[PDB]
């Protein structure tokens, strides 16, 4: 009933981003399948790079020196403490930065859908400010599909929308 | 009529941390930290490890009678040894350069025992000598299978030459007897002489007679110290000895690998499993980039870190409207 | 008199982001307290993460070898050179990247306040292009407060606004 | 004839971002020189930082040990494997991340030009949804230059625009 | 009627660098690089260092008479030594494996001197011998407090055994006399023999008689070379000597810690201050993640970097409306 | 009338990878990875390397008659040695501590050979001895130019003292003869003694006579083992020898540098070129941050990585409207 401004939708079950419509023929949730897939491929690519770029040298446990070489064993230990601190700090900050960016990426994708719809409708709708548009003309299932597919024609519905705008203006 | 733009919510309880916010609920996430302890010892990339059972590596190599002999040509990805092996070096002495030897034989593609010296060639001397500190069964007296303790030299010079006509390097191990006193020296060798020079390729190793008492260990105030060398394809080795010497009657032909693994110290048995990365407290059979299980590992491994968790957000902020 | 497009306000003394209103009753600066507090928490969290994640192994100064072991001392010295070059490069770029993002973060928060006001007013105001809105009806302190609190009623003022817009379209 | 929404322009040859216009006098491409220069300085600063921050200790090849110290030579070898894996991973992820951001940066800069035109024209134009604006009044070369320079006067063409809009509304 | 959206400017002169721009003015910012020099030597985490005053570590451990004696049990977080100690090894000779010893004693939870050997138990021999190279003051011949120089063996074999019955390891330090010539060997020992074996746990150390001239150093062409070992809890040590031996009459029970610190080399005094991280040029009492003060440090420290500054923007671009 | 906002496209075939997408066409890009193999050996920051031609470093240092004598005072930024030098240590024996020595002489600001000992000072002795194992441009017997083999000592003690009064440290190299048997020992020295002590500063090095046969190597069952040491400014060295000594007649004065480089192993010759970074398979004359050419390098170098490519996007997504 309300849009992305107020939160997420339990009812959107076939994708990441999408639409909810209401008209005389009924209502429903529908995923923007293409925006979802594109975001899925991007996130999968990100996760797979973080994983697959770790292509390592063969790891050895041969780290022993003779009993009169404790100083060398200590060097081996502080080498490993050195790398432990590098990898720990870097891994920790990578996760925190990437999580911030991943959440923003989702916000940018949702905003893009909103902007795409906003610009098709123009003043044939009133932006309700909650992620929803109040459409100023009868918008049936074919009309809804056209908005979703990006093929909505402003001028087709301009006259009817303008008359509806008049009584609001009173 | 209305159309709304929105996004997916679900019943996930997963949360993630970001640089700006803590404990943010998300619809899905993915861990990049392997954290699982399973305690299994496996094969490494389909290659089995050498299981020393209750023996130490030096005991297995020299052939402590209580250790299983190597009968067939074999290979292994790494070596599994008990934390405190029951069967170690039985005649007290030091095994020289054990750390460097591990680098050579911790991962091998071919490994085979062979007789190298016919001990019957030397005369006026006794051979295959034995000791109650190295028994097979209780109250017995035996000795390392691979090594041949020669006695009663009486100061006589024994000379031996060998060429490696195989295409793999040859590992040999020998011993040098430090006697407790002149009387023992006489009892064992019949002369106050007994020094040995062994030559491998162009390296010369000389062991002059040393007579000196030590503390009693496993019944012995005397010592036999062990040394090893590698003879390369077409390389020669030679021995000159007037006594006090334990001969490398047997040796091992072997083929090196490029990847050095090491010894996994564990009480556990090898299980019927396979892993790309192994530690002494379990397999890390994962390609995730990080792990917090153990500092030391072998194989194709994630990097060790001390993070408790490293969870990437994949999904959306899980903030459904009422 | 002008807004964010043209620069910051020395007169905004009690917050990071906010408003300046002008009506018949008076004029003045006021912070958006909630947008400010939210941003402060985010930046505090960022800084505290960058500092607190440096959780290190105990550091030792035992790096000595015997006089016939200079090759080992040299190994120990190049180990420290190695970590020095790692930490120095990574610390520099981290600061450079995090500063770029912190500044973008502030821009995004200001733009958000802007968008929120804009979608509330709709055509009840003219966007002057400098971060300010010329509103087409008398807007008293309660009205100004409502705009700031997000409870402005577009339909309450539609009629008065339309009349003034007509006088403008001439 | 279409804009950034649908892709780039081979015809824009003197800058990174810019405009294409169409009026009675004719048509043509023109770079936004200022926005281009600002972005160029930004990207040059980025690449130079990534390169110049690599200020290193003097590198040596003295890494040998005697024939009875193979365990020390092994420690030396794994120290280099260690640094090898640290630099490889971090260099790879640095490039992947910076490339994602450089592309977003270009997108942001194009969006800025678009927002700046949109807010000047307001309802004197119809947003065609493809990166272009259909202007509701005659807009000669001077007028076009004013839009590109940010000095376009809304109220000067309002009456003419309102007349053309009412015709569309029929 | 008008409403505007805007943001905060102030009079700040701070600037930051970003990946894209240099020297950008901001309303506030925060450094994450510790830069401050204070030159103080402090307690580390509430725990005081061992002040060696003007002695070297070996001189203090062995009890050079010019160094202060450890009268009561103590502990310390690190060792503070002058760069060039006035009082070092007085009887010339080498101190074996000092680097390995530092790893053991640089950070201790307990350290207590105790008499290990009753030197009256030996007969036909002189003890507590003394030398002009180790004075307590000018012309006052003396010797290390902890090490007992035994002479006039005449080839007689002395025997000693000790059992560590504490829960703390025991550090012992001894010396072996290399005489210059047969005549010197005679006046000190009365025989052309003088060899020692010292056994600690399973380990045997043998020091045969060495008679050989060296260059004169502080009046001496002979040498006393020093060695040390650790007797673990429930372990024993024993000594068999026929001469040329400086006995470990006193030793130190000590409790190891996990965190190895080391020796801080400096002429400064220890001040009344506490820090989480110490360097030889001053304390880095900071939780900032980086420092550019010194490559070597001890404790809970920021990482050393070459940067001149590392400043994070926290506030806004400070670009007030003209 | 219309106005549109747009951006640049071109016919670049360049692609980059990002965290979200692979092979994205862009209008421009810039590699930060140096990849080019040129196979040149160069000067390093304007400083020439030392070219050993076909001598090994010890053979050159000692002055094997078959390599070129250093005549002038010289300097070098690194050392260039053949992988398999034709001319090495001609008289069989070990060269002590080569690796530590390399750290001292790999990069020098000044390097100059001088005569240190006047060998004509010794009577009843033969000097400048010669051997068929160390021949000239063939054949005829000779010896290392810097090292003077003294014979026919007949148990007589020789004594030498030297003071370094120069302001640079001095490198000296000496040898000690291990004879095969008593008959050989008598043939060379005329007596069954031959022991040497060389003191440098406060360090004493003692080489007692060793008679022991080895394998025949270049016509020799005996050996000469080589040692070296550094005499600091205002320090002395001395030698006491009764035989079996090869004297350090010549030495090198040198000036140490702060930047340790090492030995470049290659068969290539030095080219008239100049680089800031050198590897043994070519120069890396670049300020790029990373390189994938070789693990081992010298100078001011990019970091070694395993990547095949590191390409930063600079331009825009190259997706022109159809
Ligand atoms: C650290 O040293 C401890 C003492 O060392 C001994 O004295 C030194 C000065 C030196 O001479 C060294 O060579 C000596 O061995 C040592 O503890 C000793 O261990 C001995 C066994 O190795 C043990 O010998 C036994 O002595 C018994 C004598 O009677 C006991 O009770 C008497 C009551 O007054 C009194 O005299 C003492 O309390 C005596 O201990 C014998 O009864 C016994 O005979 C058995 O063994 C014979 C041969 O093996 C058999 O033929 C016979 O049939 C019996 O079975 C045996 O000789 C010493 O008593 C013992 N000394 C003390 C004071 O405890 C530590 O070694 C052992 O530690 C003991 C406690 C055990 O755990 C044992 O297994 C350890 O090996 C030693 N610690 C280490 C780590 O080596
Ligand atoms: C971005 O690439 C554009 C495409 O280039 C084409 O693909 C490249 C990968 C490469 O293989 C190139 O050879 C291809 O041409 C490029 O645009 C091209 O520019 C060419 C240079 O003038 C031009 O060549 C002409 O082609 C004529 C062929 O006729 C056209 O129509 C034919 C229908 O069947 C078909 O063949 C193609 O569609 C052809 O375009 C030739 O007749 C003409 O010959 C004259 O000039 C020759 C040398 O200049 C003389 O030797 C000869 O005697 C004649 O006088 C000439 O070969 C391509 O037509 C043109 N392609 C298209 C589709 O426009 C861009 O470079 C240039 O773009 C043109 C339009 C100009 O603006 C020019 O200033 C640009 O440099 C290139 N973008 C940039 C900025 O470089
Ligand atoms: C590097 O070696 C230097 C030379 O070593 C000496 O000769 C070698 C060949 C070898 O035999 C070696 O064993 C010799 O010691 C050495 O410099 C020497 O240091 C000696 C003291 O350690 C010193 O002895 C003094 O000799 C004086 C007489 O000689 C002077 O006059 C002579 C005739 O005109 C002339 O031939 C000499 O060159 C001198 O100019 C004695 O007067 C003096 O006795 C007095 O002082 C003693 C203590 O100071 C008292 O005990 C005594 O009662 C008298 O009052 C003393 O015996 C040598 O002269 C000196 N040789 C030279 C040529 O200088 C370096 O060590 C010392 O350097 C000297 C200058 C001091 O600074 C000292 O502190 C240094 O240790 C030596 N360098 C090092 C670092 O070891
Ligand atoms: C000895 O030095 C160590 C440093 O590491 C060393 O550990 C030794 C055992 C040894 O192996 C050595 O080689 C190795 O380098 C010190 O241990 C660190 O110091 C303290 C412990 O008091 C810890 O710092 C604080 O940790 C607090 C709590 O931990 C946090 O838990 C919560 C979980 O909700 C979470 O916020 C984080 O995960 C934290 O881990 C924090 O409140 C506080 O702010 C500090 O950060 C630190 O974690 C310890 N590290 C390790 C590896 O143990 C010892 O204190 C030194 N020993 C002595 C007696 O001084
Ligand atoms: C031996 O281990 C290497 C590890 O890489 C390095 O190369 C070695 C030759 C040696 O120099 C080591 O010290 C180095 O660390 C490993 O090679 C890697 O294997 C992984 C397996 O997942 C590959 O993904 C990766 O590409 C590869 N990396 C490198 C740098 O080569 C070897 O495994 C591979 O060996 C090659 C010869 C093939 O048999 C291949 O199928 C196998 O994965 C490993 N060698 C063996 C025989 O196991
Ligand atoms: C020796 O190598 C220098 C690299 O850094 C070294 O510093 C030494 C003191 C020593 O600790 C080495 O272990 C360590 O690796 C190098 O100096 C570097 O030059 C950079 C050029 O941009 C400067 O940033 C900086 O001075 C220095 N880098 C660092 C991190 O210290 C020397 O080469 C250059 O030295 C500087 C001072 C220049 O002015 C020139 O004299 C010279 O090109 C190098 N010395 C020599 C003689 O090659
Ligand atoms: C381009 O269009 C503009 C907008 O109408 C014209 O400029 C305006 O002219 C009116 C009077 O005609 C004047 O009141 C405005 O101040 C002026 N606005 C702008 C944006 O400058 C312009 O026509 C006029 O140009 C001016 C400079 C003058 O020469 C006048 O005589 C002329 O009619 C248009 N330019 C052309 C060549 O058509
Ligand atoms: C849904 O409504 C749309 C919009 O009116 C209808 O599309 C038009 O239908 C009218 C009358 O049938 C025609 O005059 C137009 O030619 C149609 N225009 C388009 C967009 O094709 C559509 O027919 C309606 N669909 C249903 C199922 O009633
Ligand atoms: C290894 O030993 C063999 C002997 O079994 C050596 O072969 C002889 O070499 C000498 C000179 O090198 C020749 O004169 C003989 O003709 C060879 N005899 C045989 C039967 O081959 C061989 O040279 C030795 N290897 C080395 C490196 O000395
Ligand atoms: C502020 O402006 C509004 C709009 O003209 C007026 O407040 C209205 O007053 C009456 C009863 O209070 C009702 O028409 C509305 O419920 C009120 N609107 C609001 C904003 O609640 C009034 O002119 C002004 N209010 C004050 C404080 O004078
Ligand atoms: C290494 O790079 C430097 C810097 O580009 C080169 O030095 C230049 O060499 C050219 C000759 O081709 C001369 O103009 C100057 O000596 C340098 N250029 C300037 C203007 O500074 C050097 O030639 C490169 N080394 C090699 C052989 O690749
Ligand atoms: C170190 O930090 C603590 C806690 O802030 C403080 O009490 C103490 O004064 C500091 N020590 C120094 C060196 O000032």
Numbering used by the authors:
A (entry chain F), C (entry chain D), D (entry chain B): 6 to 175
B (entry chain E), E (entry chain C), F (entry chain A): 11 to 53, 53A, 54 to 81, 81A, 82 to 96, 96A, 97 to 125, 125A, ...
Task: Please share text taken word for word from the publication where this structure appeared.
Two highly similar crystal structures of the A/bat/Peru/10 HA ectodomain were independently determined to 2.15 and 2.24 Å resolution (Cα r.m.s.d. of 0.25 Å and 0.34 Å between equivalent monomers and trimers). The overall H18 HA trimer is similar to other HA structures with a membrane-distal globular head comprising the RBS and the vestigial esterase domain, and a membrane-proximal stem region containing the putative monobasic HA1/HA2 cleavage site and fusion peptide. The H18 HA ectodomain was expressed in the HA0 form. In contrast, H18 HA has a dramatic alteration of the binding site residues where only three (Trp153, His183, and Tyr195) of the key RBS residues in influenza A viruses are conserved, although Glu190 and Gly225 represent consensus sequences in avian HAs. Significantly, Leu194 in influenza A and B viruses, another critical residue for sialic acid binding, is replaced by Tyr194 in H18. Together with other larger residues, including Asp136, Gln155, and Asp228, which are unique to H18 and H17 HA bat proteins, the addition of Tyr194 dramatically flattens and widens the RBS as compared to pandemic 2009 H1 and other HAs. The crystal structure and glycan array analysis of A/bat/Peru/10 HA indicate that sialic acid is not the receptor for attachment to host cells, consistent with similar analyses of bat NAL that showed substitution of catalytic residues and no sialidase activity in recombinant bat NAL preparations.
We have characterized a new influenza virus from a flat-faced fruit bat (Artibeus planirostris) in the Amazon River basin in northern Peru. While our phylogenetic analysis indicated that the Peruvian bat virus shares common ancestry with recently identified Guatemalan H17N10 bat viruses, their genetic and phylogenetic divergence is such that we propose that their HA and NA genes be designated as new subtypes H18 and N11, respectively. The influenza HA and NA proteins are critical for interaction with the host and determining the subtype of influenza type A viruses.
